Amino acid sequence: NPYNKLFEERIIFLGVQVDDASANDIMAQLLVLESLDPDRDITMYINSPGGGFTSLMAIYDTMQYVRADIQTVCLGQAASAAAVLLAAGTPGKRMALPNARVLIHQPSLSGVIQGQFSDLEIQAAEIERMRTLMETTLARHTGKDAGVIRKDTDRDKILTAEEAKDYGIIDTVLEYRKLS
Amino acid sequence: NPYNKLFEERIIFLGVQVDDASANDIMAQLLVLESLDPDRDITMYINSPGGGFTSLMAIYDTMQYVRADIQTVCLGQAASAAAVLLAAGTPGKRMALPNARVLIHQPSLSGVIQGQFSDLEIQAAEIERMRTLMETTLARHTGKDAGVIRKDTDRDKILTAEEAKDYGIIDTVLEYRKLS
Amino acid sequence: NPYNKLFEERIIFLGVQVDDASANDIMAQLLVLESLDPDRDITMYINSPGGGFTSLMAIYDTMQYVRADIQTVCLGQAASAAAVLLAAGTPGKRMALPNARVLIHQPSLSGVIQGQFSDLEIQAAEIERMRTLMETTLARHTGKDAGVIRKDTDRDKILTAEEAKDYGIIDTVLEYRKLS
């Protein structure tokens, strides 16, 4: 199996929709790699359309929590939660191949959530707290101010790898190191 | 298992719909084969109806990123994303058996995406960037100009193996090497 | 497992609907058997209702491409893609048990494909190219002229094993070799 073979090579794949199950798989892999060697850098390849904000914050907390550094390499697309996780890597070791996508926007609810107006007010304050927490994470990880993140992630802010490096989501664009 | 047996023989199969899961499987296989031997040519057999553009760019970035050369052999049909991945192989080692298909057209959205007119404008600019990036990739890989790719992939441009070799998608048509 | 046991005995089963997944499985098995021994004849047992034309041409290209000869033995039915793949075997080694069926007709679209009249014209020219390529393959493999194949596969041309041998789809009818 290639996933296990790269797991022995300290490589994690954030390759599916970011839900609680994929979040727990990524957290278990990160904790295993941290218990194995807490100094060697954990490589996280990110090709994901995102998902829930709680799974996003779980993976972010586990990436910042492990003693090993997280080299997040974005491939293809890091939308919604995967772009915040891509910026959540170790500063100076955040990579993305040149044709990868970075989609940053405010968190949204998957469908309609019904209830009384007090419960709707609570859910609205909670998604506003989610938006503020995502903006604070992107401000602390990209070097920008939270207000610039707030205007930019007001709608779908879509960037390339270079555009994400100028934005601060990644710290280096990875060249093609093919020998030919 | 024949897939694992050919994986020890440095052979990868792009044989399903190009979504994020198949993209991550192909990327994991490519990274394993690169970590095993970065000089031996990775053979990628391509029989796929394509899929998303982000998974397309992920597989393209990983194919160009690995130190091993990518001999892309198209079998049957390299449609949409699989034709761009077929052209994404190493120059001089892009193959296709004579009755294979190469379908190149502009990227489309799978269904209807709703939202406000600003979000629709953002999605339209994003799919225009996808079209321009696909045209630039095909221009840099087939030797043609991006405008010729733009007129040709305006609609479904369907080519045979010989027609793809004259077009530049492949560099060689593979003869039938049967001993009889 | 009987499939793997016969795979060590150089026997491949074309026993399901001919889609891209089954096509890639058959191609992987053929390439493994070619890499194992390129002189020993690959036996392909064919009991299939067919499927897509692109998977048909993929399996045909891989059967003609491998260095090993392809003894195609039709069991029960070889409709559509199967019958062309049955004729695609090595000349002189194409077999079918006496009560097998061979259904040859022009390729059809599975359902309705919508779009603008230019896209419909392109799809019509493509399915006409599919019909012409199937007729050319059957003419080069059965010894007949492409026009006779065109009139015969205009509708569902259904033949027995003897009728397929007189037609040229197979080169020998296999007798029942039971000892009693």
Place this chain on the structure above:
Amino acid sequence: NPYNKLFEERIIFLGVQVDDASANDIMAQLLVLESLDPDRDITMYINSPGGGFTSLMAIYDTMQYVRADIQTVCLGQAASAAAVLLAAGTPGKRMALPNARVLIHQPSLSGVIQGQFSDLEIQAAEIERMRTLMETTLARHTGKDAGVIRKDTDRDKILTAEEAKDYGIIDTVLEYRKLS
């Protein structure tokens, strides 16, 4: 596993609906048992509601084709294709336990098949050829004349084990060999 354990004991189970997949499984098992020992009798236990006629003829051709004799023991029901396959066993070694069912009728189409009247005429001639081939198989295997099979299988002819032995579908009724 009991199926594999009886497969080492030369026992095959025709226990599901006779479609192309079950047909190919039965053919693979028969070919493995023939390659193992072509003299030892292959026992085929038949408890099946039948299915397609092409899979029926595939299993019949493979049973007559293998060098080993086929002792078909009907349990519960040998209905439709399963009955013709029960009569398709080696003469003198066709068995059925006393409370088994044998349902013989003309082959039918599973649902409605649409198309032009020429295609419907072709499908009607094909199902008439199927009816004639089933009647010829039952006449050559049960000792009766094809016309008697034609009147009997005009509708659902349902027989017990004794009634199938007098009819000729089986050559022996198997007694209960319990020691008590």
Place this chain on the structure above:
Amino acid sequence: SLTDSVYERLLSERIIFLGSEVNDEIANRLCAQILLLAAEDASKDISLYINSPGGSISAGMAIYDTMVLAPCDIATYAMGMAASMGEFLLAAGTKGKRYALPHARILMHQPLGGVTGSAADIAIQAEQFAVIKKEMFRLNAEFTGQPIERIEADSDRDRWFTAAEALEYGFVDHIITR
């Protein structure tokens, strides 16, 4: 249709019915009936019998505005069930002419609804829901004569009233008894 026939025959007698969930279609039907009855005679009472399981606020807002802006005094009749927009439109009647049948059940609760879209869209929906709830509670305080804080504390969840309980609270002014 027999139901439409008896409805038009009671409309000729200035008796309208809020007999279903208050959606925009039934609301426009009721406002059209109110406008027709006001164009026929602007001095005779319009009897609105309400048997409704609730519905839309906008619809209820339209019915309420048509009730107040019609020169006729809208006599509302709580008939069996007045839940949500039913009780809001029942208490919206003319003071001294709001009635409850002696076994009607009146359900006053906070407006309900749904949030969707991006975070800014859900925040905008939050401002709109807060304004809607404040307007509905101020209007219910205007109708029942109760303080707005008691209205909001009682309609925080489902708050049930009988005929006498709604007469004591202020949704209706009399209990019809024979």
Place this chain on the structure above:
Amino acid sequence: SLTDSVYERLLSERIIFLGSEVNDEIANRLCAQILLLAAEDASKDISLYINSPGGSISAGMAIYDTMVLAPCDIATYAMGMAASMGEFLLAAGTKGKRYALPHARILMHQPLGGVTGSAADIAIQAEQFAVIKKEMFRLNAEFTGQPIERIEADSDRDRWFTAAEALEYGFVDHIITR
């Protein structure tokens, strides 16, 4: 039908209703009613009560053109809900004769829709959506008297107005009060 009966009876009194989502069918019904009322009397006002959750722009464009091209002065009445095409057709009324009921809720937001097809088709749909949005915003600026930049900045998302807020913005000219 009772609803169709009271609708035709108020159509005889030159009172039409935009009481559902503005699709092409309801739009053609409203334009037919407007053309009939203009053929009957071209000097009397046509009262259009709008309780609509929005709908199609084309439908709204058809209703708007029929409103302005009919010699009668179309008096619009915001009744409960005027969202999107409802507020666009409410503000489309004659100046000085656009009214809002005192508790109607008016929702102005950028036009919405979907993109489909190939990249060139979605680009063409992008040009068309940009032209549609610019035309709708210029028309709303013509109606409300506000600058087009304020219209676009406010209708970037869901923008809510009460009766007094819409009177201050310019969708309506008076607030009907008794």
Place this chain on the structure above:
Amino acid sequence: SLTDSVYERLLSERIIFLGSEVNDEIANRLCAQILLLAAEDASKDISLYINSPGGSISAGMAIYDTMVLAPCDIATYAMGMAASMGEFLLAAGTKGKRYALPHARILMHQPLGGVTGSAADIAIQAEQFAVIKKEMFRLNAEFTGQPIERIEADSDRDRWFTAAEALEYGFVDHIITR
């Protein structure tokens, strides 16, 4: 039905409506209305207000033939939306009597459809689609006065026109303005 009532009342005034997707049923209804209006008076204009999202060509062909062979001069009115068969039937009106309301949106694009059956059946459908597209483009060139090559190059994909753009292209002859 109120909608059918106002439709028949405007049919008595020789005003017909293409207010939905042009399928065979609505097409036969429109052709029956045209034949009735031609049997009543063959010298008075038939006003066809078109608010249609497109539909069937055979249906559009039937409506077009009924429009031409009708002794009456069919004055078409682009009302809000004229897409595909809507614009084809709008431009099919009498020259000098084709009008567009000042905010109607007109969508001209190559005919669409589907291919099914065997390869010979799909080839036959290809010949038929080519003949259909050539006939529609030649007819649009006859209507608008444009060359057929410009028609085919513009209607290769979705081609959008406003009122003034369609007046410049040739679908309509005047823009109704007050």
Place this chain on the structure above:
Amino acid sequence: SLTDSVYERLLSERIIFLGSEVNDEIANRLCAQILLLAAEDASKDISLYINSPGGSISAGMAIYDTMVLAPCDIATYAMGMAASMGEFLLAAGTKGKRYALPHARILMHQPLGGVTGSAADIAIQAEQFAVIKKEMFRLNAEFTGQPIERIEADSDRDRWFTAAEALEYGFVDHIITR
């Protein structure tokens, strides 16, 4: 209903419509209209405008028999689309009185259907389909004046005709032009 109203008004003028798929219900409606028009006046022409995508043969057989046995001369009018049973009933009209509108599309293909049941049932259905196809082809040869072998060779698959092509083949006798 407006559509039924204009249909009955044109039935009073002896103009019937085959405007949908020819199923047994629409067929019995058309035969009832033909029998009524023959009972009213047996010397005046019955105009049958056909815009049909095909349908059942039995239904087409019923309509055809009602057309012939009707004392009146059934003038058929190919209006837009005459496919399968539409073209069969169009060519079934009286000789010299079968017309095609100048842009109608006429499809003549072999009858289609379905087989089911046991092998004897499908064989019986095969005899019945062969007899049906031979009868339909002999009747089309009677109508168009073409040989039956040319009819069967042309209607083996979908065979398309314009107005002039159907006039040359023999489905219609004149092309209505103004």
Place this chain on the structure above:
Amino acid sequence: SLTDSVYERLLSERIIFLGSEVNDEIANRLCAQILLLAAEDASKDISLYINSPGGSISAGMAIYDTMVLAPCDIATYAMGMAASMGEFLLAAGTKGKRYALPHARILMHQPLGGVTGSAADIAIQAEQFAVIKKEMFRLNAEFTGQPIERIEADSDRDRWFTAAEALEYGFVDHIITR
């Protein structure tokens, strides 16, 4: 409804239609029409045009009993399709007054149905199906004048007849020709 209108207009002329599948509802409609026509005039013929794909026997039994017991002579007309209950009710007409249109297709086959429940219930259903089949075959032998054994041997499966074949068998007595 236009179809119901022409059906009632032909009912006034004593022409009824069996134009759908013979279920219990259509059967009771036909028996009510027969009873009404017998109450109006018991000496004039009732013309029953049958275009039916079959249906229920009970329903066919009800229609048949209403046909025979009505003092009027029920002239049946095979119109296009007479299958199962159609043919049974077509041959059920008065002797010398059963007609077939020259291209009607008549399908006589054994009654079909379904078994369900326990073994005793299915055995009871078997006795009932045997009695039903024997009664239907004896009645068809009474109608056509053929022996019951030939009826059962022919209707063992789908048995098809043209107009002349059904005239030779005995379902009808004349072939209407002009």
